[PDB]
């Protein structure tokens, strides 16, 4: 079918730890990842979904595999404790997608941020023009709590779909602990 | 047609993979694949070899498990570089090299896809230094045997250089398969970095070798060297006698002085000259 | 199941009988020396796992 | 010991011909081998 | 402080440099050998001691100047004796 | 170049080795053994063997096909 | 804890072939792979290896990748073809000890406890043995950091094996200065061994480059050994070390005087066995 490789970047930072969302923040984002990796598998059997983090230690928790049983086994007692480090989060997200079996796939990443970021906006726009010369489209979806009216992420997606990119979006977080299934119902319906 | 100058270029890495897999599981006939880079009508090049696991107890070539190779063919494909299977091998343990009737059938299943898959036999037992026992083969059609026609249409004086063994000539050579002359692809990227790394003595000759016992060993030889010279004070005395060609047959029971007596002199020299010199370089260098 | 048991004989017919011998002494780690229950005395090796 | 080498290698002479094995018996060896291969 | 030529001090010098009497300096050094801070031997009739091993101390950027210079002409002594080797045993092995 | 063939000749000694017994020698470097298959033979030697390690009644090694001293 | 490592020439060649198949990238790639083998009787053995896909961007060089699915199944195959063979650690191509090799080791210590690394050579030139290995040790200790960890080199050599010495000595065919007599030692350790001590003397000169000008950490634990080398420097020539030296020269050369005396009469007897075949042959044959 259409050639992509869906790569989710899960959020094991230390601000996603409370119990304001109804089951858990961890389980509600997990089953959201489950129904969208069921969305990317059943529309195209070639796509595999592994998970990466953007914490202090950007670990390959589960390897990029079409199995999800390792994903389901590690996300139980996953210990989401760590200072968020998004300035290395692009480089772990981009260089992973060059380690793939096919470079003819559409480079697509989703990114979950539920913690206050301490990046430089000048450093990301150097990474944004780095991604301009690398032709990468990433739809970042905001979870949890953050600086409201998300700071430095509007200017990054704007400098992501620049130079005739014009296809990316920025799904921001509503600061109310509602059920997050309908929150992500917009990327599963259209891009 | 073929010009009997087929000249199989192989490798430097595969031969070590061939002998290690052929020696560790020796008395059962083991096998594997040949993952090389195919070239023109004349030659063929096999650079990589991966080994295939067995099936059960018993000397056989049993069958290939295409579950294993299909996952293996795309294993290193995603990591290194693409290659293509150009042949296969097995290992006669202590025989030599031929195609048995069991060996020929699994060959004939492999020549169906490509007409140039090479059957390779290695023998990791009759090999010592300058012998690596080899001579890969390939089938000939038995259809041409009924015609009485001699194949392979010799256009160069390059094929009939090696002479086949008579034990392989008992088998299907030359009625079902043929030999192929091979050489080896060596290069300085590998040649120097295995020569200068194998036997390098570190600081051994800058020692004194057990200084009370070296002069003790300098009598452990000399004492029986006296009586071995008494034999040399004996065997020369029964000459001008029965025609010393007779002194060649007759001296196979008991020991002779003359060879044994020039033996220890080499031992009592290199043990002394090396140890006396190394003592006198330590005095200068160490203060 | 009538093809199951008859498939066991399809590959059971490839095992080879083994000469029954007797160990006389041991020269080195690999040099063994035996005599069969037939006749002559041999010098023999082993597997590396046995 | 050098002079007992340097004054010793003169009677090496008339080493006439190192014969490999034969012409005839080599051919008879080849015929005997061809008989075994046919057998 | 003493070089590696002698480092052989006497008991009278200890009685000078520590102003302690003669009948106690033997008890002083056996304690020093037992703790392990020094390794040497003890004479009694010539009233000297053959100290061999001492405890390693620390040093500033001035004592490395001595260790630079005592090392430096020891470099060419390895050059000089090996210069006989490759020039006299040259035809033994190309 | 001679030292290459000096070690190369010992491929014959490899594993599958049978046992005979020394009886006598005709001459230099050729002898007569008796196999443990019962039949005697007129055999050749291998040159690295010290001949003065022979004959009390010496148990020897023989090649399994060509049947000479090993 | 680990005595030494034993490296076979297979795995030595099983890196350089991989360095050639990635040598087409041109710009920069380090060969990092998985090292397979055992260790028995406290001696580290190295038998087999392969290489894992790996990339590295120069900016923010703390982002590495090991495709562990490629690490799982290929070891799953190699355990299946050889149950005796197992993991022993890892390796990297090691020109100059790149920075990721402090936590590559900690990434994959969940397979081997003593996960040893191996530094190899791709451009062979030295007067030694260009195969390096370290070990992982950590310390809550003296001065640097609350979390401190630095690799320590364990001794390294190329071990042999009976099966591979057939193939190793077959692939050389170039030069091999065998026939160990009175001059094998003269060159393997008397020409070369004195020049062996050259680069060991010259190595502490390279540390000595910091007298007042070099790098900022100064000594603390480097000089206790160097204080001892000049202290344990050997005994001078005043004692019977003079006299007992001439004692053994007057003992070792006696055996040399006897043995050389023997060599003359032996070759003199061999002269007589050549005059028996000269004068007693000309009258007979002609
Ligand atoms: Zn076979």
- Cβ atoms of E40 and E50 closer than 8 Å: yes
Q: Is G238 helix (H, G, I), strand (E, B) or coil?
A: coil
Judge whether G31 and G17 are in contact, CB under 8 Å. no
What crossing angle do the helices spanning B14-24 and G9-21 adopt, rounded to 10°? 140
- Residues ≥6 apart with Cβ < 8 Å to D22: D28, D29
CA distance G190 to chain B (A): 7
G46: nearest Cα among G76, G4, G100 = G4
Cβ-nearest to F52 among B125, B129, B255: B255
Could you give the angle at the alpha carbon of E79 between the alpha carbons of E75 and E80, nearest 5°?
115
> Token pair of G167, please?
């193939």
For F25, which of B94, B128, B249 is closest by C-beta distance?
B249
What count of residues does chain D have? 39
B182-183 and B8-9 strand pairing: parallel
DSSP G62-129: T-----HHHHHHHHHHHHHH-SS--EEEEEE--SS--TTTTTHHHHSTTT-TT-B-EE--SS---SS-
Q: Phi first, then psi: what are they for B87, rounded to 5°?
A: 170, -160
Return the HEC string of chain A: CCCEEEEEECCCCCCCCCCCCCCCHHHHHHHHHHHHHHHHHHHCCCCCCCEECCECCCCCCCCCCCCCHHHHHHCCCCCCCCCECCCCHHHHHHHHHHCCCCCCCEEEEEEEECCCCCCCHHHHHHHHHHHHCCCCEEEEEECCCCCCCCCCCHHHHHCCCCCCCCCCCEECCCCCCCCCCCCCHHHHHCC
A66 contacts: CB under 8 Å, gap ≥ 6:
A41, A48, A49
Measured CA to CA in angstroms, residue A26 lies from A16, A31, A146, A179, G105 at distances of: 7, 9, 16, 13, 30
DSSP helix, strand, coil percent of chain B (3-state; round to 5) = 35, 15, 55
Nearest-5° Cα angle at B28, B22 to B29: 65
User: Cα–chain-centroid distance for residue C45?
Assistant: 12
How many whole angstroms separate alpha carbon G240 and alpha carbon G246?
9
Size of interface E-G (CB pairs under 8 A): 63
CA distances from G200 to D31, E82, G206 (A): 67, 15, 10
The residues pairing with B34 across neighbouring beta strands, listed in sequence order, are B87
Residues of C in contact with F38 (CB under 8 A): 39
Q: What is the whole-number distance in angstroms between the Cα of residue B122 and the centre of ligand 1? A: 10
Strands (E), chain B: 8-9, 31-37, 44-48, 84-91, 118-122, 137-139, 177-179, 182-183
CB A114 within 8 A of CB A146: yes
Buried b (16+ CB within 10 A) or exposed e, G214-248: eeeeeeeeebeebbeeeeeeeeeeeeeeeeeeeee
Q: Is the dihedral of CA A108, A112, A113, A118 positive or negative?
A: negative
Question: Which among A176, A189, A149, A143 is positioned nearest to A28, based on CA atoms?
Answer: A143
Q: What are phi and psi of G118, to 5 degrees?
A: -135, 125
Cβ–Cβ below 8 Å for B53 and G174 = no
Residues 6+ apart with CB under 8 A from G65: A60, A95, A96, A99, G53, G54, G55
Three-class DSSP labels, chain C: CHHHHHHHHHHHCCCCCCCCCCEEEECCCCCEEEECCCCCEEEECCCCCC
User: Cβ–Cβ of B170/D33 closer than 8 Å?
Assistant: no
Q: Is G255 helix (H, G, I), strand (E, B) or coil?
A: helix
The answer to whether B251 contacts F28, with C-beta atoms less than 8 Å apart, is no
- As given in the structure block, the two tokens for residue A21 are 């969302």
Compute the distance between CA of residue B85 and CA of residue F61 in angstroms, rounded to an integer: 44
**Angstrom distance (rounded) from CA F25 to CA B249:** 7
Query: How many Cβ atoms from other residues are within 10 Å of residue G119's Cβ?
Result: 20
φ, ψ at B273 (rounded to 5°) = -70, -35
Q: At what angle do helices B222-232 and B211-220 cross, to 10 degrees?
A: 20
Encoded tokens for G151: 């690799």
Spatial distance between the Cα atoms of A128 and A109, rounded to a whole number of angstroms: 14
Q: d(Cα A14, Cα A115) in Å, to the nearest integer?
A: 8
Q: What distance in Å separates the CA atoms of residue G268 and residue G286, rounded to the nearest whole number?
A: 26
G224: chain E residues, CB-CB within 8 Å: 56
Residue (of F19, G109, F70) closest to C25 by Cα position: F19
Distance from CA of G211 to the nearest CA of E (A): 6
Which stretches does DSSP call E strand in G140-231?
Answer: 148-153, 156-158
CA angle at G89 for the pair G86 and G90, rounded to the nearest 5°: 120
- Rg of chain B over Cα atoms, rounded to whole angstroms, equals 29
Q: At B70, list the tokens.
A: 């299909």
Contacts with B24 from chain C: Cβ below 8 Å: 48
Question: Of B282, B274, B287, nearest to B209 (Cα)?
Answer: B274
Q: What is the rounded (10 degree) CA torsion for B112, B117, B121, B124?
A: -130
Cβ contact, residue pair B270, G182, below 8 Å = yes
Q: Is B91 helix (H, G, I), strand (E, B) or coil?
A: strand
CB neighbours (10 Å) of residue G51?
23
Chains in touch with C (3+ beta-carbon pairs under 8 Å) read B, F
Interface contacts D/G by beta carbons within 8 Å? 22
Which of B23, B58, B63, B125 to substitute to test the interface with C, most C CBs within 10 Å? B58
CA B47–ligand 1 middle distance (angstroms) = 22
**DSSP letter for each residue of B238-285:** T-SSS-TTHHHHGGGSS--HHHHHHHHHHHHHHHHHHHHHHHHHHHHH
CA distances from B208 to A57, G200, G239 (A): 55, 20, 20
Write phi, then psi, for E45 (nearest 5 degrees): -90, -30
* Residue G283 sits at the chain D interface (C-beta within 8 Å): no
- Prior bond to F59 cis, omega within 30? no
CA distances from B151 to B103, B142, B170, D38, F17 (A): 22, 11, 19, 20, 39
CA distance B248 to chain F (A): 6
Alpha carbon separation from B258 to B233, F50, G272 (Å, rounded):
10, 14, 13
Please identify which residue in the block is written with the tokens 């010799």. Answer: B154
Of residues B95, B105, B196, B89, the one with CA closest to residue B137: B89
DSSP reduced 3-state for F30: strand
Backbone angles phi, psi at B85, to 5 degrees: -70, 115
Angle formed at CA G124 by CA G122 and CA G125, multiple of 5 degrees: 140
Q: State the DSSP string of G196-218.
A: HHHHHHHHHHHHGGGSSSS-S--
Residues 6+ apart with CB under 8 A from G116: G2, G5, G35, G44, G88, G89, G90, G133, G134, G135, G136, G154
Q: Do chains F and E touch (3 or more CB pairs under 8 A)?
A: no
B257-285 and B222-232 helices cross at what angle (nearest 10)? 150
Interatomic CA distance for residues A169 and A137, integer angstroms? 9
Instruction: Determine the straight-line distance between the first and last CA of chain E, rounded to whole angstroms.
Output: 49
> Among B160, B116, B158, B112, which Cα is nearest to B137's?
B116
CB G133, CB G5: distance < 8 Å:
yes
B74 CA distance to ligand 1 middle (Å): 28
Is the separation of the CB atoms in G63 and A91 below 8 Å? yes
Residue with tokens 């059962």: B28
Interface test with F, best of B133, B244, B249 (most F CBs within 10 A): B249
- Tokens for C46, please give them: 């082993």
CB atoms under 10 Å from CB of G276, counted, come to 14
Instruction: Closest CB to G233: pick one of E4, E53, E86.
Output: E4
Instruction: List all residues 6 or more positions away from B163 whose beta carbon is below 8 Å from its beta carbon.
Output: none
Instruction: Write down how long chain F is.
Output: 70
User: Are the C-beta atoms of residues G21 and B50 closer than 8 Å to each other?
Assistant: no
**Cβ contacts of B209 within 8 Å, gap of 6 or more:** B275
| Residues A150/A116, Cβ–Cβ less than 8 Å | no
For E76, the closest chain B residue by CA position comes to B285
Residue in D4, D10, D14 closest to G268 by CB: D4
Structure's resolution in angstroms: 3.0
Strands B31-37 and B84-91: antiparallel
**Is E74 within 8 Å of G230 (Cβ atoms)?**
no
Contact status, residue A4 vs residue A105, Cβ threshold 8 Å:
yes
Which CA distances in Å does G107 have to G36, G58, G88, G104, G112? 17, 20, 15, 5, 11
Tell me the CB-side half-sphere exposure of residue B287, using CA atoms within 13 A: 12
Give the residue carrying structure tokens 């005595």.
Answer: G3
């Amino acid at each position: 079918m259409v050639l992509e490789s869906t790569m989710v970047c899960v959020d094991n930072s230390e601000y996603m730890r409370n119990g304001d969302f109804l089951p858990t923040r961890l389980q509600a984002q997990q089953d959201a990842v489950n129904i969208v990796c069921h969305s990317k598998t059943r529309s195209n059997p070639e796509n595999n979904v592994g998970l990466i983090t953007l914490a202090n230690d950007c670990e390959v928790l589960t390897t990029l595999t079409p199995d999800t049983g390792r994903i389901l086994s590690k996300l139980h007692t996953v210990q989401p404790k760590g200072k968020i480090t998004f300035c290395t989060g692009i480089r772990v997200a981009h260089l992973a997608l060059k380690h793939r079996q096919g470079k003819n796939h559409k480079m697509r990443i989703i990114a979950f941020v539920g913690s206050p970021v301490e990046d430089n906006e000048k450093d990301l726009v150097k990474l944004a023009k780095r991604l301009k010369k690398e032709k990468v489209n990433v739809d970042i979806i905001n979870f949890g709590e953050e600086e409201v009216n998300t700071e430095k992420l509007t200017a990054f997606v704007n400098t992501l779909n620049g130079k005739d990119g014009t296809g990316s979006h920025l799904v921001t977080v509503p600061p109310g602990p509602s059920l997050a299934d309908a929150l992500i119902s917009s990327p599963i319906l259209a891009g | 047609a073929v010009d009997t100058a087929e000249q199989v270029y192989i490798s430097s890495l595969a031969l070590l993979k061939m002998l290690k897999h052929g020696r560790a599981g020796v008395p059962m006939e083991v096998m594997g694949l040949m993952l090389g880079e195919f070239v023109d009508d004349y030659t063929v090049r096999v650079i990589d070899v991966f080994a295939m696991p067995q099936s059960g107890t018993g000397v056989s070539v049993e069958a290939v498990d295409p579950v294993f190779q299909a996952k293996m063919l795309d294993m290193l494909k995603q990591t290194g570089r693409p290659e293509m299977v150009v042949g296969w091998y097995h290992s006669h343990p202590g025989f030599g090299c031929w195609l048995s009737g069991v060996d020929i059938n699994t060959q004939q299943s492999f020549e169906a896809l490509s007409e140039r898959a090479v059957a390779v036999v290695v023998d990791p037992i009759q090999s010592v230094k300058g012998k690596v026992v080899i001579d890969a083969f390939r089938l000939i059609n038995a259809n041409m045997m009924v015609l009485g026609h001699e194949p392979r249409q010799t256009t160069s004086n390059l094929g009939h250089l090696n002479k086949p063994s008579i034990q392989a000539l008992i088998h299907g050579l030359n009625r079902h398969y043929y030999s192929i002359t091979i050489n080896y692809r060596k290069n300085e990227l590998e040649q120097k970095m295995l020569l200068n790394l194998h036997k390098k003595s570190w600081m051994e000759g800058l020692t004194l070798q057990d200084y009370s016992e070296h002069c003790k060993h300098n009598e452990s030889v000399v004492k029986e060297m006296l009586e071995l010279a008494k034999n040399y004070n004996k065997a020369v005395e029964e000459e001008d006698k029965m025609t010393p060609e007779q002194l060649a047959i007759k001296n196979v029971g008991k020991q002779d002085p003359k060879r044994h007596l020039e033996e220890h002199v080499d031992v009592l020299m290199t043990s002394n000259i090396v140890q006396c010199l190394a003592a006198m370089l330590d005095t200068v260098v160490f203060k | 199941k009538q093809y199951e048991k008859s498939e066991n004989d399809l590959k059971a017919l490839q095992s080879v009988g083994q000469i029954v011998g007797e160990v006389l002494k041991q020269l080195t780690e690999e040099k063994f020396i035996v005599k069969a229950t037939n006749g002559p005395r041999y010098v023999v090796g082993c597997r590396r796992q046995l | 010991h050098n002079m007992s080498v340097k004054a010793m290698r003169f009677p090496p002479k008339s080493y006439n011909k190192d014969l490999e094995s034969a012409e005839e018996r080599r051919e008879r060896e080849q015929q005997d081998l061809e008989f075994a291969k046919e057998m | 402080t003493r070089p590696a030529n002698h480092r052989q001090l006497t008991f009278e010098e200890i009685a000078k440099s520590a102003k302690i009497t003669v009948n106690e300096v033997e008890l002083l050094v056996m304690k020093a050998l037992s703790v392990g801070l020094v390794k040497g031997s003890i004479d009694e009739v010539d009233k000297r001691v053959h100290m061999t091993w001492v405890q390693p101390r620390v040093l500033d950027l001035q004592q490395i100047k001595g260790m630079k210079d005592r090392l430096e002409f020891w470099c060419t002594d390895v050059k000089s004796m090996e210069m006989l080797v490759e020039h006299q045993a040259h035809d033994i092995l190309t | 170049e001679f030292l290459h063939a000096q070690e190369e000749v010992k491929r014959i000694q490899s594993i599958p080795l049978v046992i005979g017994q020394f009886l006598e020698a005709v001459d230099q470097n050729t002898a007569i053994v008796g196999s443990t298959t019962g039949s005697n033979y007129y055999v050749r030697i291998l040159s690295t063997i010290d001949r003065e390690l022979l004959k009390p009644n010496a148990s020897v090694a023989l090649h399994k096909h060509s049947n000479a001293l090993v | 804890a680990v005595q030494k490592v034993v490296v076979h020439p297979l795995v030595l060649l099983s890196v350089v072939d991989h360095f050639n198949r990635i040598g087409k990238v041109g710009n920069q790639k380090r060969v990092v792979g998985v090292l397979l083998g055992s260790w028995q009787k406290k001696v580290l053995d190295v038998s087999n290896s392969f290489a894992v896909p790996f990339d590295e961007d120069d900016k923010d060089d703390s982002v590495w990748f090991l495709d562990h699915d490629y690490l799982e199944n290929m070891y799953g195959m190699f355990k299946k073809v050889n149950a005796r063979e197992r993991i022993v650690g890892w390796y990297h191509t090691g020109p100059k000890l790149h920075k990721n090799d402090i936590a590559i080791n900690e990434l994959m210590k969940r397979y081997c406890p003593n996960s040893v690394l191996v530094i190899i050579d791709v451009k062979p030139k030295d007067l030694g043995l260009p195969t390096e290995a370290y070990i992982s040790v950590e310390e809550v200790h003296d001065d640097g950091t609350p979390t401190s960890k630095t690799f320590e080199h364990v001794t390294s050599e190329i071990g042999a094996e009976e099966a591979e010495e057939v193939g190793v000595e077959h692939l050389l065919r170039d030069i091999k200065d065998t026939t160990v007599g009175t001059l094998s030692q003269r060159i393997t350790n008397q020409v070369h061994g004195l020049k062996g001590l050259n680069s060991k003397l010259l190595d502490i000169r390279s540390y000595l480059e910091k007298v007042a000008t070099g790098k900022l950490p100064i000594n603390h634990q480097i000089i206790y050994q160097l204080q001892d080398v000049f202290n344990l420097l050997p005994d001078v020539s005043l004692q019977e070390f003079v006299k007992a030296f001439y004692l053994k020269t007057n003992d070792q050369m006696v055996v040399v005087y006897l043995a050389s005396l023997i060599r003359s009469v032996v070759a003199l007897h061999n002269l007589i066995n050549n005059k028996i075949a000269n004068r007693d042959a000309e009258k007979k044959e002609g």
